[PDB]
Amino acid sequence: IAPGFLRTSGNQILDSQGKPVQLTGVNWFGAQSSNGVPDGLWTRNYKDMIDQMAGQGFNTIRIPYASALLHTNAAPSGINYNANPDLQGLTRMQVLDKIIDYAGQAGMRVILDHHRSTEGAGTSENGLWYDSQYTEDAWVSDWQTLATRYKNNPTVIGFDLHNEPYNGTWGGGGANDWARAAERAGNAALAINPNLLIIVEGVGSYKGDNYWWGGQLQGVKDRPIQLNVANRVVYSPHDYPNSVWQQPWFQGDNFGAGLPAKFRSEWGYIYEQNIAPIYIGEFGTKLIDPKDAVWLEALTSYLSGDFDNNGTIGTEDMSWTFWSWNPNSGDTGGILADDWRTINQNKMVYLKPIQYT
Template sequence: MFRTLRRALCVAAALLLPLAGVQSARADGADEAAGAGYWHTSGRQILDAAGKPVRIAGVNWFGFETANHVVHGLWARDYKSMIDQMKSLGYNTIRMPYSDDILKPGTMPDGISHDGKNTDLRGLTSLQVLDRIVAYAGQSGLKIVLDRHRPDAAGQSALWYTASVPESTWITNLKALATRYKGNSTVIGIDLHNEPHDPACWGCGDTSRDWRLAAQRAGNAVLSANPELLIMVEGVQSYNGTNGWWGGNLMGVAQHPVQLDVPDRLVYSAHDYATSVAQQSWFSDPSFPANMPGIWDKYWGYIFKQNIAPVWLGEFGTTLQSSVDQKWLAELVKYLRSTSAYGADGFHWTFWSWNPNSGDTGGILKDDWQTVDTVKDGYLASIKAPGFDPGPGPGPGGPGDPGGGNATCSAAYTVGSDWGGGFNAEVKVTNTGTLPLKSWKVTWTWSGAQKVTNMWNASHTQNGATVTALNAAHNGSVPVGGSASFGLSGAPGGGGATGVSCTAT
């Protein structure tokens, strides 16, 4: 976004403009099953592996680029329920900002609750958490665009390098991510660097400032690691004396296009905002908002309209508190072209943001990380696009399976009845990982002298107050997201358990 540091302020926007006749959240169409495999470009369109046109219509879910080193909101919710909700609202892509910090060995996430949620993320590094998010998004039919948002968690940078994160590190890390997810078409592309701005230039020829040349170097490096990825290249702030939003000025493409070694992989990306982020001269023009299509044409829209390349509006957002912002968003949505009228032949987009804790825009979610801002979401209804078929799950040792093939599970222990002299309990085992379970065991500890007197649908051993239960022959196999149960009787009463854990293979 157009600022040096993101503010994590939970600001509730007072949204005033009701929408009449909002279109359905998911567009109908014959291309419902589009999106298979890796994608490529053809003119201004993005096509899937079968040549079907697709439209990116998604949200930004930030956090990996901050000092938390993980997407925000996992202190409030399970990551799977978050992705499920995105899908249910009709979003088909997640732009995932990150900083190079998460590629430092051993970087751990901060701000994840494991209390009844995110249990399969316990003990994982930031990169391994990203693996799990990518895996579940893919199984849910969502795509991911990785966004190198910051060189480190301290803040954004005007150029693609800093004194502490040189260009060589930037490129090495981009190639590492391209290699990590090679073969997993859930990760459809990489946004090389977020919001280049002054002194960055486009086409000036100074290799220390020319973002277009740097994007070519980095893009070709990524494609050398995985030639199937889309390369997203943002604009700059200024071109030939004309100022715009950070990353939002693509005027230089007309004379100085990005040239990649692999054809049909380039997507240009712009950012555009309203007055809740910053003022611009066009907002006070007497003809506003009728002047806005001409502004967008000048900065980035011409690339699409002249069939040069696809254009992706990687960030746009507002609190919607002012009438100017409301008019801006309504005009922008119209400019991006409705899916019902144009299908996938429109601008691609990811809204800023899913998170409510973006101080100058707010998000699709309200401050409780659960409730949808239906007014803001409603503005986007006409440009939402069909989702994609779920992709195949990653194989053993793949990105969705950090740790080399170990499946994961959780166990919930519930006392059903207790009559003082004894009790009955049920244990539910859930596959929380990305691979089917072949077998499982559950361990817990009682606080007193309780002993197992009977157990069904599992076998057990007991050592003092600690019990270990192993699956029976018929219920050891548990599919991803599935569950199995077993029961037991014990004596005396008071059979509540602590330290319940599940181990799976």
Template structure:
């Protein structure tokens, strides 16, 4: 609700590399994009899962071939801050981060931006070009860098949702306009981005404005405050430029005197749905957070966390359950430091758990955030911008979704391509922490062949009495010191040259790093 807490932490580690001008940007909420070098044929698009532009049917999102698809993604913020570019490029190459997102089983990115990146003369800062990092971004404008991110994401099968996060880098706004950025500018810039990525279905849609809140209303009829009417105006403008895009519409804070999270209250949809000139394009977006962001009454309910499904049903879940439209939880996150937060995340993941064929008949989501420098939630990455917070990522394992085929349908690792070579893989075992009584480790599976993997299996033998105590992004069996770990549902498919990672905890420590064999199909 009160998002003044949401601040992007200044990256102390980044200061060792180069100064971060303006990284003090506000909470840097929430995940982009250029025309593909290759134009897909209609036949290739129809064959590849998730290919082409998407549309809606009842509560489902469908791809160009009518197959149900589900967004299971991550927010990567920074374009909405004074850096005018995604954060973390002071530490790593952007391609390595996109590769890592895919390897972890995320299939989409929500990419927040502010209207500042569309201004003439806008420049990006805090990018490290040393050692060849980000070499192809040097000298580019923020929009040209966004083009590069979208192009590479599409090559790897990641989808992108553009999120108009703020009117400018100075901070969040309750309404979709400010004195400095009027509604006309907002709509003009939305149309500009829709036009820029027209013909490139890597960019599946636009989140029109992040977290409208009081005095914004839903259905009140006051055109200066009624977010539902503004979303219709903006959505129709976007679709006039590119009628294929999905239009993601967040809620408000208060409806009929009932308040919730900023952008998270969609109670008004029941009486006043968003109606656009192009049918089957609206996806409603909710935001939901834990106590590390702000306290809410439901956290202190004596029945917590059993009360939470009823809370979510009331604010936004009913839209999905009543088959009104698809729902996408565009932001949810937590530091996971408190027991309440841990119970909240477990309950929300259970609420989002997939149902239906391929798990597609379920609520879509993008977790907040990839970035570790979100002050009240942290991220999937730790402060070094490389190490994965395997506990946090592990909570999401059961709600991740199958990935989508690489962008142009002609990659040798594309499952839709005929022919190909013999599946092959290698595996590397790394001990990430060993405290004697126990340890954590990670195994990276790499597709070393020329055709996509459908599934993989790894095997190793410890020298001592080590046993796995918990595992994420894989399943396992153990017989004596020998362990066999197989892919989870979301990360069995690995493109040629790509990789997937799983991790686990074990005890006792001191087992070292045994050699691992990998079998692929």
């Protein structure tokens, strides 16, 4: 991708020369945990991992973090400093700086994702972007601190304002209105860096329709995100297979035939109607449950622009980051095997045709 920040135009993400580009990467989680740094540095070197990502055709790293990362003085834990000698004596944020810096040198971009408030493993137990101790005020101010820190670094292209706010609502104006909260944090971040992409995930349910956490983007049609800087909003659904949860739209034979219409109903319509870009922030599978393959086959085809999954498709297709680069995800696994080095080729076969080239 051409150097400099990005922008949106219709359902397209454009580089600094007006050319449509595509973000096709992986999730590298860990910085939201108690260690305060992305996982795997207890056995791998951080430059070797980024090079391996780029060598597999990926160009984007979604990096989850926790609010607690921005206020802790604890040193990072777990890093093997024999294998990562350049990270010796660095703070948790300084290790993030090192990772972002090298990723830009390797031709990759970075999306920061507020995964949770406290240090933990996955999605916030609250289903919200705040709790009784980590306020929405501090969440907004923390996004301003991050925007300031990477204001002059176009490697950091976008802010994923919050991971899966499945207990928020799309509208209503109250304290749990995720659309209001996202517009508040988006404008606060854009006031410091107006060149950031503002990545807004969906909720969990909307007018009685329940979908994957983060993948319920049905509210955009009647109440879209409106920020004080134009051409910055990217919508980010999450989608997963039967092995993660036995959803009703996976049940019964011929379920795969109705998956394209299901993708379009919850979030895909935003791209098809040229409303805004679509960047699915999470999706993964171990490819053991046979229904998982039917889902991934339909999903990858839909993301490519084959909205009816028949075979027919100067714009780019939908952007995406796979869950995960890490192997240590219990339900989905990742791109790397448990040894944190071996590539799972059976997943790469699905991903390579929809990577940005």
